[PDB]
């Protein structure tokens, strides 16, 4: 119970219901490395589905019931046994309470039942942490899992631009996007967008952006232009526009991807080919991503799981690959790879996949 809650001092930066957003912090005195982790957990995109989320997923929409501490797990653990990579870093967990894939910039008001302030929550956390030691940082790693991994892709360059404009050009901003690299592919079975369950991600994100006043990275926005900013929520389209170094972690057969593809798991030929094609398409999108870790498993999320050290690609674990990435950011390194993408074509053809 080692990260302590701080509600934002700027109480106009809020969770969906107007309660203050916040962050959990465990400082490491004398470390100059800061890890800011974005939680995930889907999204909502209209009044009716946000109301239902408010009933049964309220911690993702409000801080009113948040506990005063959380235990750091995985990459947020302070024990080297659990976190070989960054156990001595300053650790920040930012709860996801904006339901907008960390993209929103709209307040609750007479016109809006809910606030969607994900993009502003990240900016405000950064600004308040500067006074608590982040001003001395050498590396700020913005990490995130699930929708928080997409949030890294949408926000890492804005954090860099914010620190530059605040006069901290020496802080190196980097991103670690876990399980947020999705494909706008054909669904295995097809449903027109007539309610929440039938609405595919491209259409739900298109509606979400309008409902949230969602914002995307400027270079990506300039490519796709107005009405088409939903494209920037898809990693393979937004990543080439980014300037900050980003390490991408993605299971090849991601469970949330399969869910949005209407796949629910004795597999017959059509579904077999669908699954194999998904893994091939994911692998293809990572071909030119130099820092990546993509095991052939059916799962979702990795970096805050306590057993995150167990999975390996080509005999290299994720904490090792991240360490090699750090070294690369000081020509490739002998025996210390950073591009690790499985080539085998079926879930759990990698023996180290989670059980
Ligand atoms: O991982 C999560 O928390 C749930 C799934 C999620 O968030 N999805 C899946 C499809 C998609 C496209 C763009 C942005 C986000 C998402
Ligand atoms: C509070 O946050 C809002 C929204 O991001 C911002 O416009 C405003 O400048 C902030 N105020 C202070 C005092 O930080």
Author numbering: 87 to 351, 355 to 419, 427 to 451
Quoted passage from the original study:
The carboxylesterase Notum hydrolyzes a palmitoleate moiety from Wingless/Integrated(Wnt) ligands and deactivates Wnt signaling. Notum inhibitors can restore Wnt signaling which may be of therapeutic benefit for pathologies such as osteoporosis and Alzheimer’s disease. The overall structure maintained the characteristic apo Notum fold, with a α/β hydrolase core domain (β1-8 strands and αB, C, and F helices) and a moveable lid domain (αA, D, and E helices). Notum, like many other carboxylesterases, catalyzes reactions by forming a covalent acyl-enzyme intermediate.
To investigate the structural basis for this observation, we first soaked Notum crystals with 2 and determined a 1.4 Å resolution structure. The electron density for the acid head and indole ring electron densities were obvious, but there was little or no density for the butyric carbons, indicative of a degree of disorder. The electron density for the butyric carbons was restored when 2 was soaked into Notum S232A mutant crystals, consistent with the disorder arising from S232 sterically hindering optimal positioning of the acid form. Superposition of these two complexes with the 1 complex shows the interplay between nucleophile position and covalent or noncovalent inhibitor binding, with a shift in the S232 Cα of 0.6 Å between complexes involving 1 or 2. Our complex structures of the acid form 2 with Notum or its mutant demonstrate that the indole ring forms strong hydrophobic interactions with the Notum pocket residues and remains within the pocket.
